[PDB]
PDB file of C-alpha atoms in Angstrom:
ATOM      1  CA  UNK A   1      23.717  -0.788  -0.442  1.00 38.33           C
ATOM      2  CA  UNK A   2      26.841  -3.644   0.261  1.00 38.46           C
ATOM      3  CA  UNK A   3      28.777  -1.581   1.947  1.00 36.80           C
ATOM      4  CA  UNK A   4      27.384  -2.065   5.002  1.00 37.68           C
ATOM      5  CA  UNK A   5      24.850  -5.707   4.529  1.00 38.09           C
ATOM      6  CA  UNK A   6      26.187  -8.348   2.969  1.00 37.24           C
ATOM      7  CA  UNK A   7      24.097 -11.170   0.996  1.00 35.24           C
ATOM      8  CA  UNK A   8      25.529 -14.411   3.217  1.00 34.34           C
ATOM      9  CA  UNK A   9      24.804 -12.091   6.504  1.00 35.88           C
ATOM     10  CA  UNK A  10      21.150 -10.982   5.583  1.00 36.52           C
ATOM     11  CA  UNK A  11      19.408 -12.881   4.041  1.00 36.11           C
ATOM     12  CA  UNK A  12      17.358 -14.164   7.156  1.00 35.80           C
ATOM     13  CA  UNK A  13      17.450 -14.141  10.548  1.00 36.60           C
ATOM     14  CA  UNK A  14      13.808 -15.071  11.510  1.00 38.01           C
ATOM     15  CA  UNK A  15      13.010 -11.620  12.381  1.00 37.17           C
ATOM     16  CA  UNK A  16       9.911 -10.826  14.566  1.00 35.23           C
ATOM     17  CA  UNK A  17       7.512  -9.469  13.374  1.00 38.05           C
ATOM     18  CA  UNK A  18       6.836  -6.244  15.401  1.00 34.18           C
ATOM     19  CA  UNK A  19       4.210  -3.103  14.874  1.00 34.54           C
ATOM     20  CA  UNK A  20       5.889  -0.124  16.798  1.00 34.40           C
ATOM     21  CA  UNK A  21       9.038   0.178  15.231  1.00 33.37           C
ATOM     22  CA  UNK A  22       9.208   1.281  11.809  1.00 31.31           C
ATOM     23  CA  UNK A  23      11.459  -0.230   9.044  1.00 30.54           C
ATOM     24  CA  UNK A  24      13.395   0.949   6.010  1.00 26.04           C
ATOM     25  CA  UNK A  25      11.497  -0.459   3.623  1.00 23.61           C
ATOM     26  CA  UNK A  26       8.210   0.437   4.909  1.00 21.80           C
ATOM     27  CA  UNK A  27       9.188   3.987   4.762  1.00 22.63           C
ATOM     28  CA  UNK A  28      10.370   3.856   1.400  1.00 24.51           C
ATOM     29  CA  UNK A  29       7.662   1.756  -0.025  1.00 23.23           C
ATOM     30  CA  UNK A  30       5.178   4.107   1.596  1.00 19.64           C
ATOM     31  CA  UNK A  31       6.713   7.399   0.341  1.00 17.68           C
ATOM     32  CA  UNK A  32       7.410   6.168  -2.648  1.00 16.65           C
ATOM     33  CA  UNK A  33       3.832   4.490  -3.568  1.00 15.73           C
ATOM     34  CA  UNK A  34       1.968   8.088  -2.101  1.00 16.70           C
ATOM     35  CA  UNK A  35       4.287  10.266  -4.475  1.00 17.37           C
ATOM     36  CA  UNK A  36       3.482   7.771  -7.450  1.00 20.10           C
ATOM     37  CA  UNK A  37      -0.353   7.944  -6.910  1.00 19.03           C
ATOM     38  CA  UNK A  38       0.093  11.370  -5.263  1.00 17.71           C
ATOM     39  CA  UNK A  39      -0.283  11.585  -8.933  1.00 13.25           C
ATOM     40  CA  UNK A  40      -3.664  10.196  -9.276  1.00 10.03           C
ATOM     41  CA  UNK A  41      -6.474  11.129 -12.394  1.00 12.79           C
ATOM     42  CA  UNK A  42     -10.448  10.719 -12.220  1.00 13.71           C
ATOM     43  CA  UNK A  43      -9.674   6.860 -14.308  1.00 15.06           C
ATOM     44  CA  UNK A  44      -7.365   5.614 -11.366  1.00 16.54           C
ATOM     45  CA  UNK A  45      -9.583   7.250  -8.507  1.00 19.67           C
ATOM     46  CA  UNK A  46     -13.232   5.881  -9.955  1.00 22.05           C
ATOM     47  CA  UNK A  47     -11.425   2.315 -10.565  1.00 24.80           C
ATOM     48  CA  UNK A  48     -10.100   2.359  -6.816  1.00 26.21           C
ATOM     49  CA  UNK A  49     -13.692   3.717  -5.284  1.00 25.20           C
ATOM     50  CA  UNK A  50     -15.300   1.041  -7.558  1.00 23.29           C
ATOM     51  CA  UNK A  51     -13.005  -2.102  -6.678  1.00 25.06           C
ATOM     52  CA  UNK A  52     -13.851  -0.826  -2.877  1.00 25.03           C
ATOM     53  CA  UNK A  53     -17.159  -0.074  -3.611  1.00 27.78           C
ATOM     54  CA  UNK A  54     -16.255   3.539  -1.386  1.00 25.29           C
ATOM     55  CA  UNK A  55     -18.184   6.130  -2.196  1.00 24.69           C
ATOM     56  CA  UNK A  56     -17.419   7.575  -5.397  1.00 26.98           C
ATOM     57  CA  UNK A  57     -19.764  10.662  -4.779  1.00 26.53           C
ATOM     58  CA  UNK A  58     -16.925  13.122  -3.975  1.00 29.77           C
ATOM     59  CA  UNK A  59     -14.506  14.339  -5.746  1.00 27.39           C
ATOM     60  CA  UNK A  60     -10.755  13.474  -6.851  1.00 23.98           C
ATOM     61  CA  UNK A  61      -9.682  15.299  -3.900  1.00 23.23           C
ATOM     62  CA  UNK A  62     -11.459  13.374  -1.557  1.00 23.17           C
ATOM     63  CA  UNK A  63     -10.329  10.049  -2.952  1.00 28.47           C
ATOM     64  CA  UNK A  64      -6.632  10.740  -3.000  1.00 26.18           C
ATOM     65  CA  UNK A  65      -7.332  12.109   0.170  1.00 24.41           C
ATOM     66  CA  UNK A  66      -8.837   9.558   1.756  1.00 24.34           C
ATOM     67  CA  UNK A  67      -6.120   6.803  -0.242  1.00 21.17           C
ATOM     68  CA  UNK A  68      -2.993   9.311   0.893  1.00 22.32           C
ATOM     69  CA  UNK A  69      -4.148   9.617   4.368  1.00 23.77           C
ATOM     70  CA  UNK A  70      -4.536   5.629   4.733  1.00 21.88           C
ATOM     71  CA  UNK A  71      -1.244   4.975   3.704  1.00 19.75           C
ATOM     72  CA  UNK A  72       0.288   7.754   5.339  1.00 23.46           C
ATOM     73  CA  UNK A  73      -1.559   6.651   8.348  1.00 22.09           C
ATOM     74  CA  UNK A  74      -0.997   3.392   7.478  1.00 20.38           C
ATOM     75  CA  UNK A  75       2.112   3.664   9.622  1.00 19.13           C
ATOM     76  CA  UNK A  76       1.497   5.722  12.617  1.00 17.50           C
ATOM     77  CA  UNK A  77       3.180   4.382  16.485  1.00 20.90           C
ATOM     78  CA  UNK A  78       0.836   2.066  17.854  1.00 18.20           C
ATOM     79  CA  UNK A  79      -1.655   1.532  14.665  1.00 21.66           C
ATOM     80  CA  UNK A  80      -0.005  -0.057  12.060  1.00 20.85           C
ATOM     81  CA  UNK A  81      -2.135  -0.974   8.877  1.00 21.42           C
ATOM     82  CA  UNK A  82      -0.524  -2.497   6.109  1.00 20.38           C
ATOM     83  CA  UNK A  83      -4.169  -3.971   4.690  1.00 18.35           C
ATOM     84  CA  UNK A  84      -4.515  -0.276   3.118  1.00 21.74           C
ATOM     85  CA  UNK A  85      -0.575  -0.451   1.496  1.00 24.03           C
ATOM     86  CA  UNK A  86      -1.071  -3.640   0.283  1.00 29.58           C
ATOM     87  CA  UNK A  87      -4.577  -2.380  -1.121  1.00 29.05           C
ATOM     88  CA  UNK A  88      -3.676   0.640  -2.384  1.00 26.95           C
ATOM     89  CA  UNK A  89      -0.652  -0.395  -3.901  1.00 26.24           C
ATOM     90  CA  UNK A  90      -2.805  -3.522  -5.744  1.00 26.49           C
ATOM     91  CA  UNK A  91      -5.018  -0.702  -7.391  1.00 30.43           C
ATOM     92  CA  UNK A  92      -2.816   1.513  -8.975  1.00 28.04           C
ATOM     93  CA  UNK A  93      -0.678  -1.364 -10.092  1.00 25.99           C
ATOM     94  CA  UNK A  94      -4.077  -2.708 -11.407  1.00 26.21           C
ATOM     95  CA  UNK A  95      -5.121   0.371 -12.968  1.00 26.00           C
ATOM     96  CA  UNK A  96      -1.345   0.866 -14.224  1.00 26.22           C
ATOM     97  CA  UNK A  97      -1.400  -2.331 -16.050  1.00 26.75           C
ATOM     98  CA  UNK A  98      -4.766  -2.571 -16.836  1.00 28.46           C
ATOM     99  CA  UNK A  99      -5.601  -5.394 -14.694  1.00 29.61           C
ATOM    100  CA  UNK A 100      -9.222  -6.644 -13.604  1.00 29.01           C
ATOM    101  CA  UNK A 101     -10.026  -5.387 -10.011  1.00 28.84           C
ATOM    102  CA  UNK A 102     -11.547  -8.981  -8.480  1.00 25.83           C
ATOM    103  CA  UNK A 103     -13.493  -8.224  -4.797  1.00 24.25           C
ATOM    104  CA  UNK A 104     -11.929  -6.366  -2.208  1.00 21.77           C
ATOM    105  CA  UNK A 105     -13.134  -8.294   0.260  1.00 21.66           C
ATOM    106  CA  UNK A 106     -11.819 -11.560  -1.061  1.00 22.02           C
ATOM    107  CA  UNK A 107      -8.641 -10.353  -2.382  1.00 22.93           C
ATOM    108  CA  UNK A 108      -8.031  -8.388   0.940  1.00 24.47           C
ATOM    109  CA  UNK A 109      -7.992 -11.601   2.741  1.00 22.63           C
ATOM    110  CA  UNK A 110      -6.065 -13.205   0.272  1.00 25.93           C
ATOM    111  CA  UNK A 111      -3.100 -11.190   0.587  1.00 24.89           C
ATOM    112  CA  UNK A 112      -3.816 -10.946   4.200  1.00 24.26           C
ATOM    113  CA  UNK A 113      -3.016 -14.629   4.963  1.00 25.62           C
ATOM    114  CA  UNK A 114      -1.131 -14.355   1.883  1.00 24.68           C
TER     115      UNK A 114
END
């Protein structure tokens, strides 16, 4: 909340940019976006598998398994991987809003230097 930041005393303070110790926000955004798509349906799984080209030949288990696990892995001490948050989180938002899913490869790198 503002009971304990303040707006004129956080709003940058050229941070680094570390990999072992976890923030707030990563947390949240992480739980939050896994219990959202924990939530998944054979239309948001196929569109995710197709926009990665993974291998569609399982079932919707194995997707949101494979999509939960990344994420939830996605932060783990000493193997951070925000490529799959960002990733993950761009597909459901796509499929949410019924957005075009461009190539993963390009669009990972976009956001990546992004």
């Amino acid at each position: 909340g503002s009971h304990m930041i303040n707006l004129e005393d956080y709003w940058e303070d050229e941070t680094p940019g570390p990999d072992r110790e976890p923030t707030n926000e990563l947390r949240n955004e992480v739980e939050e976006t896994i219990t959202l798509m924990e939530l998944l349906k054979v239309s948001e799984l196929k569109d995710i598998c197709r926009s990665v080209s993974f291998p569609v030949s399982g079932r919707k288990a194995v997707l949101q398994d494979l999509i939960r696990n990344f994420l939830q892995n996605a932060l783990v001490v000493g193997k951070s991987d925000p490529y799959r948050v960002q990733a993950v989180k761009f597909l459901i938002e796509r499929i949410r809003k019924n957005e075009p899913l461009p190539v993963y490869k390009d669009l990972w790198n976009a956001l990546r230097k992004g």
